[model samples]
Target: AMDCTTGPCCRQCKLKPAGTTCWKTSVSSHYCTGRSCECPSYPGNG
Candidate 1:
């Protein structure tokens, strides 16, 4: 699993390829900017 604290500005923030789980930490509900994060699915092993 990949641990990405920063995600892209694309439509899907999670960017999870598929068959994987995205874990977001230290997410602040107050702000809708940096508080958001995502982790993409591991490559090749979906």
Candidate 2:
């Protein structure tokens, strides 16, 4: 989950910090590139 797997976080990537950082996917493609880099850190997400 450290990278965008499939989502919009790619287009809306924000700066995060530490293991709970928000990885966005807006390189030049989708899935793992422009997808859900919503890394569920901090004890993990639901």
Candidate 3:
């Protein structure tokens, strides 16, 4: 899929995107903010 989506990215501090399944290290929760788009999914705790 499309990793590194192109908007409102708070990284692990925002609503993570559903692009790369291996983006974040441990996908847990989101804080939600900024102008938005899409990004990675899942975590390192797989």
Candidate 4:
């Protein structure tokens, strides 16, 4: 899966194509900000 560091200003951040997952969750790539995404953050997984 693709790894990314997202955020508001991350618009210029590198984002992999679809079919890849964020470094934080198993969810497929969509859009994220900073190091966080729209996915839920687990206790220690956050």
lDDT (Cα) of model 4: 0.36
The candidate, 1 or 3, that scores higher on lDDT is: 3
Top lDDT hit? 3
**lDDT by residue (tens digit), candidate 4, 1-46:** 5455554223335543333333343442233333443322322222
Error of 4 at 19 (Å): 0.7
Residue lDDT tens for model 2, 1-46: 4443333333345423333424332433212222244443233222
TM-score (all chains, Cα) for each model: 0.19, 0.16, 0.18, 0.22
Please report how far candidate 2 places residue 11 from its true position, in Å: 12
Give all candidate RMSDs, comma-separated: 13.2, 11.6, 10.3, 10.1
- lDDT string, candidate 3, 1-46, tens digits: 6454544343544445344332333435322223344332323233
Prediction-by-prediction clash tally: 0, 7, 2, 4
Q: lDDT of each model, Cα atoms only? A: 0.34, 0.34, 0.38, 0.36
Candidate 1, residue 39: Cα displacement in angstroms equals 13
TM-score of 2: 0.16
Comparing 2 and 4 on TM-score, the stronger one: 4
For residue 33, model 4's alpha carbon misses the true position, in angstroms, by 14
Q: Rank the candidate models, highest TM-score first.
A: 4, 1, 3, 2
